[PDB]
Amino acid sequence: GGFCTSAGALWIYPTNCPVRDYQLHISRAALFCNTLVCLPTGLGKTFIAAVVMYNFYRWFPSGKVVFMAPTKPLVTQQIEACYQVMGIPQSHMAEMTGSTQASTRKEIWCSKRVLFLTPQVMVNDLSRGACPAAEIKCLVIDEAHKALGNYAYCQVVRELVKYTNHFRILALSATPGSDIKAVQQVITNLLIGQIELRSEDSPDILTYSHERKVEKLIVPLGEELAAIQKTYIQILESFARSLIQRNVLMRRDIPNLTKYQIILARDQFRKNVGIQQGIIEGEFAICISLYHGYELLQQMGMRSLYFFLCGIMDGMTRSKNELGRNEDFMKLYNHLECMFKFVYSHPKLKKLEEVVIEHFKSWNAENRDETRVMIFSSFRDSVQEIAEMLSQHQPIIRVMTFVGHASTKGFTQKEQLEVVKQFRDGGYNTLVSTCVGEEGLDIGEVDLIICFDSQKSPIRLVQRMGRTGRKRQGRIVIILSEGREERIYNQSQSNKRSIYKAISSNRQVLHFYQRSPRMVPDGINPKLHKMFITH
DNA sequence: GGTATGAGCACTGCTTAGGCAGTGCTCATACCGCATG
């Protein structure tokens, strides 16, 4: 399929940077079989992709190589980083996103050999015949753990296979899935023939990366929030009884239920008439909102609870009317209204402030290159509250929030990049980030990472810890409320080990795609050629 | 329920034109959630 016999004699490996065994072995593996590469962040998933893409570029000179990333900033970062490693002239490559008109993309597809794009552009260009589907010989998928359900990654492969089976897939993920079931879906969706995995624990990784120790700070909930929690549980009980009596909700202890368990109960209901549907849907929507509020109170604090409730109690939803007829709700809501110096709406926030102050004290005492602190909380109200709390210490602490595009106005792609550049240059020394700061964009190495919340899935914890590494031995602090939050953390670490074992096990836990094309003709055994690549 | 993201089209400012290059909007994805190999 257009394979260049002469180029097939060799596979070229860059020596610009010292050769690492794990990068040499994994690169070679990925040439001959569809591979999912799982390395810690900063240990060279991008380098391996560049090596693979450059050799496919050489081996299929009339073919195309495609690199997919989930965000526009990541596309730009990755084309730049891969350009530096590969021996491909700038004129043979292009970035393509929704910022390039579909009309222009057709000309870029035809004139370029390597394309870095968002997967939605690829889906659109395949369906509309702008992408010459048959000419694709290599497809690199970054953040490949996102290749679940009908995500654009899954759509690209399903559409491409209509036109050609003769391409290599390289998937890159530090965190292949939340569990085995998710890892199996990624393998199935992306036609993965094998996994090449190294952990922080891996000896061949320890050489090129400082081990980083996790500190846990357990914070008791305290009298004030305990008392509000106790009032909240009774409000929860009164609004959930209808679902207990309707038998749509199992009846499992009201205080121990989660918003996720009720969204599932609602979903199981929506697949099993008239006035009835309206009242049940209404009861479910009220309970899911209250249990959201309950989670905010336990994990984020009273200010987060208030702001969420204010969004509801600000139009006439049924939720607004019902909750408005409850005196305990309106008592609590009116109390939070009054409440909102700086108010410490969760004991975790006071503990977070102590840790950050002590870090800057200890750093400035050692007197000169500014320290960098990244704090992760999932909710926008928490991130703004944490930022306001730490703003009291300006300009010793120079805090900025890092949030997604949706409006608390939200940040555009351009505004996000300015905050990152400000963080890198020490304009800001402290970043408070939602999940947008966990994935892809090279923020830089950070001296202190703080996790304000915890999830049962291990993915986001590993991503958050990825923002510190070798260059400078970093510190990872995890602030947990005592009880549940401590168990969620213990579960995420157990789930991480479970996935590692399953991937590494001699027994076939995972079902790999067995029909990955060799791509190099069966006659040709390409020989390693190490060289200094010059542009 | 909130958190990201995306594309394509709307809208508007430019120093000098263009589907430029920005932000805004509507419509899609996905996750979270049992616990293990």
What is the 3-state secondary structure of A88-100? CCHHHEEEECCCC
What would the two tokens of residue A310 be? 């204010």
Ligand-binding site membership of A42 (annotated) = yes
Contact A411, A485 (CB under 8 A): no
> What are the backbone angles phi and psi of residue A87, rounded to the nearest 5°?
-100, 45
Distance A419 CA to B7 C1' (A): 25
What would the two tokens of residue A122 be? 């690829």
Ligand-binding site membership of A331 (annotated) = no
Nucleotide minimizing C1' to CA distance for residue A121: B7
CB within 7 A of strand B (chain A, 52-91): 70-73
- For chain A, what percentages of helix, strand and coil (3-state, to nearest 5) are there? 50, 15, 35
* Cα distances (angstroms) measured from residue A124 to each of A67, A127, A133, A149, A455: 16, 5, 12, 18, 34
What would the two tokens of residue A195 be? 């996994």
CB within 7 A of strand B (chain A, 395-454): 403-407, 409-416, 434-436
What would the two tokens of residue A153 be? 């990654």
Report the first-to-last Cα separation within chain A, whole angstroms: 28
Contact A374, A467 (CB under 8 A): yes
Helices (H), A95-197: 102-111, 119-127, 152-160, 180-189
Q: Which nucleotides of B are covered by protein (CB under 7 A)?
A: 1-9, 19-20, 22-25, 28-37
Ligand-binding site membership of A46 (annotated) = yes
**Nearest-CA residue to the C1' of B8?**
A98
Residue in the block written with tokens 């995972």: A510
Give CA angle at A214 (A209, A217), nearest 5°. 160
Cα distance between residue A113 and residue A111, in whole Å: 7
Contact A386, A430 (CB under 8 A): no
Cα distance between residue A431 and residue A444, in whole Å: 12
Amino acid at position A326, single letter: N
Ligand-binding site membership of A305 (annotated) = no
Phi and psi based region of residue A168 (left: phi greater than 0; alpha: psi -120 to 50; beta: remaining):
beta
Resolution in A: 2.2
Quote the radius of gyration of chain A (alpha carbons, Å). 26
Helices (H), A148-274: 152-160, 180-189, 203-206, 223-246, 259-269
Superfamily holding A214-220+345-496: P-loop containing nucleotide triphosphate hydrolases (3.40.50.300)
What would the two tokens of residue A233 be? 């549980």
Ligand-binding site membership of A40 (annotated) = yes
CB within 7 A of strand B (chain A, 89-118): 97-99, 101-104, 118
Q: How is chain A split into domains, by residue range?
A: 5-193+512-531, 214-220+345-496, 223-339
Give CA angle at A23 (A20, A29), nearest 5°. 140
**Nearest-CA residue to the C1' of B4?**
A436
**Nearest-CA residue to the C1' of B32?**
A260
Distance from chain centroid for Cα A377: 13
Give CA angle at A339 (A335, A344), nearest 5°. 125
Dihedral of alpha carbons A347, A445, A208, A366, sign: negative
CA atoms within 13 A on the CB side of A405: 6
Distance A485 CA to B37 C1' (A): 25
Strand-pair partners of A530: A13
* A149: CB within 7 A of chain B nucleic strand: yes
Experimental method: X-ray
Breaks, C-N > 2.5 A, in chain A lie after 272, 314, 340, 367, 407
Do the two domains A5-193+512-531 and A214-220+345-496 of this chain adopt the same fold? yes
Cα distance between residue A468 and residue A489, in whole Å: 19
What would the two tokens of residue A266 be? 């609602």
**Nearest-CA residue to the C1' of B37?**
A502
Give CA angle at A465 (A436, A29), nearest 5°. 95
- The SS3 assignment for A372 reads coil
Ligand-binding site membership of A41 (annotated) = yes
Calculate the dihedral angle through the C-alpha atoms of A260, A264, A267, A268, rounding to the nearest 10 degrees: -170
Question: Which CATH number is associated with domain A5-193+512-531?
Answer: 3.40.50.300
CB within 7 A of strand B (chain A, 456-485): 456-457, 459
Question: Which CATH number is associated with domain A223-339?
Answer: 1.20.1320.20
Relative to beta strand A93-96, strand A168-172 is unpaired
Distance A428 CA to B13 C1' (A): 30
Strand-pair partners of A374: A431, A449
Q: Which H or E run includes A138?
A: strand A136-142
Contacts of A5-9 spanning 24+ positions with Cβ under 8 A: A5/A521, A5/A524, A7/A58, A7/A59, A7/A61, A8/A59, A8/A520, A8/A521, A8/A524, A8/A526, A9/A524, A9/A526, A9/A527
- The SS3 assignment for A14 reads strand
* A505: CB within 7 A of chain B nucleic strand: yes
Nucleotide minimizing C1' to CA distance for residue A178: B31
Strand-pair partners of A387: none
What would the two tokens of residue A194 be? 């094998």
Within 8 A by CB and 6+ apart from A493, the residues are A458, A461
Strand-pair partners of A216: A478
* Cα distances (angstroms) measured from residue A120 to each of A46, A151, A426, A453: 21, 9, 35, 31
Distance from chain centroid for Cα A403: 13
Within 8 A by CB and 6+ apart from A361, the residues are none
